[PDB]
Amino acid sequence: ITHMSDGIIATDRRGRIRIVNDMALKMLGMAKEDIIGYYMLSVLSLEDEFKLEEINNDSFLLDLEGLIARVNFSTIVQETGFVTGYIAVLHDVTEQ
């Protein structure tokens, strides 16, 4: 489940970030101009212990000062079945 206060990142099929909201920028402590175009998993420092193909029901703890945040992933799929992209949802751990 997603909330209004969550960070959101969306990518193309190759995992490059195309959309990121201001809350995600706040949580990551980055500027948009330094995020767009780059690989999501790399931006999140999950580069090794995870890859796109594998996106699962599990939430994960993200290193962030700042916070920790918990993140869950999903795929963007067409009717043809084809995965056209990916979404990360970043939750403040003290959400509630």
Q: Which residues are annotated as a binding site for Zn(2+)?
A: 3, 6, 91, 95
Could you list the beta-strand ranges (E) of the chain.
7-11, 17-20, 60-63, 68-77, 83-92
User: Would you give the binding string for Zn ion spanning residues 33-72, x where CB under 5 A is met?
Assistant: ----------------------------------------
Residue nearer to Zn ion on the CB measure, 16 or 19: 19
Q: Which two tokens stand for residue 44?
A: 């999140």
Q: By CB under 5 A, which span of 24-32, 46-54, 63-71, 87-95 interacts with Zn ion? A: 87-95
Three-state DSSP state, 85: strand
Q: Rule CB under 5 A: say whether 32 interacts with Zn ion.
A: no
CB 17 within 8 A of CB 36: yes
